[PDB]
Design a protein around this ligand. Structure first.
Ligand SMILES: N#Cc1c(N)ncnc1-c1cnn(Cc2cccc(F)c2)c1
Length: 294
């Protein structure tokens, strides 16, 4: 007899996730089956996507030695049946207002900042880099949230200091790079490049830094197939390239430059689910058929 989701108070919504209050010290972190492409939440859900990404996140939390916000098992009785397998019970933290990003490779807004200025978030880089260039060491490229529907804004280290304090800023930088390095090496051993990743942290009652997000999902991180890694061109999205190709192809009737995109073919949604499962099983060495559900 699990509680109903309606027993809990909705406190936040993101593009493809939701957050509920369970009691004064706990929340329910819910992944949905919604998928985003080209900054649009698409009309068509991906079956099992919320469960697969939750499974991925749980695997990576277990791999990392840093404190995290998980407060119970994936089958915790406080989790409603409706969201079983795609929701986790978590401890309430005081969240730090920094999107902590690590980049092991140069792409997206990092590449654009470099092409415009020669630097990214305060880091002056070597000349001659380009799309999907490897960065060593990985860069800490923090960002801040903007208005609803707007992209996060890249900021430099001084901005992080101004937001959270000098010592805490150093801690965020160091932990973000350490965590990314560990996860990226694990994934690469399994044939997947984690090109970059985005974390949020919070602080507990005792002042301790706690990892408090989904971690190393394909929504929070760029997944690439290592076997096809080719510096100098845009890498395929391991999980979303079918979706991107169909939307921008001749069958969609949609022009990306002009705006809400049409629904996806059922076949594209099913193929996409397969890509998520493939990524999960390769990285975790586990079978998704063993992951809990309703
Ligand atoms: N995680 C976490 C968390 C925590 N453990 N304690 C306090 N606050 C948060 C918290 C508040 N906003 N978010 C972002 C977010 C996440 C998931 C779904 C959403 F809609 C929005 C995270």
């Amino acid at each position: 007899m699990r509680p109903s989701l309606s027993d809990y108070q909705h406190v936040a919504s993101g593009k493809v996730r939701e957050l509920y209050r369970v009691d004064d010290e706990h929340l329910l972190f819910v992944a949905t089956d919604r998928i985003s492409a080209f900054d649009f939440v698409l009309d068509t859900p991906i079956p099992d996507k919320g469960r697969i990404l939750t499974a991925m996140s749980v695997f990576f939390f277990g791999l990392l030695t840093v404190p995290n916000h998980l407060a119970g098992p994936p089958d915790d009785p406080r989790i409603p049946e409706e969201v079983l397998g795609r929701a986790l019970l978590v401890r309430r933290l005081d969240m730090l207002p920094v999107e902590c990003v690590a980049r092991g490779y140069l792409t997206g807004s990092g590449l654009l900042d470099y092409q415009r200025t020669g630097a990214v978030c305060g880091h002056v880089l070597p000349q001659g880099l380009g799309e999907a260039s490897r960065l060593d060491p990985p860069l800490f490229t923090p960002a801040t949230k903007a208005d609803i529907g707007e992209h996060d804004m890249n900021v430099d280290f001084a901005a992080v200091v101004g937001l959270v304090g000098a010592v805490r800023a150093n801690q965020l930088r160091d932990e973000t790079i350490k965590i990314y390095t560990r996860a990226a090496a694990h994934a690469l051993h399994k044939g997947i490049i984690l090109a970059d990743t985005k974390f949020e942290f919070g602080v507990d009652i005792e002042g301790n830094l706690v990892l408090a997000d989904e971690v190393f999902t394909p929504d929070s991180s760029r997944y690439w197939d290592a076997a096809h890694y080719q510096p100098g061109v845009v890498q395929d999205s391991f999980d979303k390239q079918f979706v991107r190709n169909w939307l921008t192809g001749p069958e969609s009737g949609w022009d990306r430059a002009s705006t809400p995109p049409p629904p996806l073919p059922d076949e594209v949604a099913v193929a996409t689910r397969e890509r998520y499962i493939e990524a999960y099983e390769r990285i975790s060495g586990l079978s998704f058929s063993d992951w809990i559900g309703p």
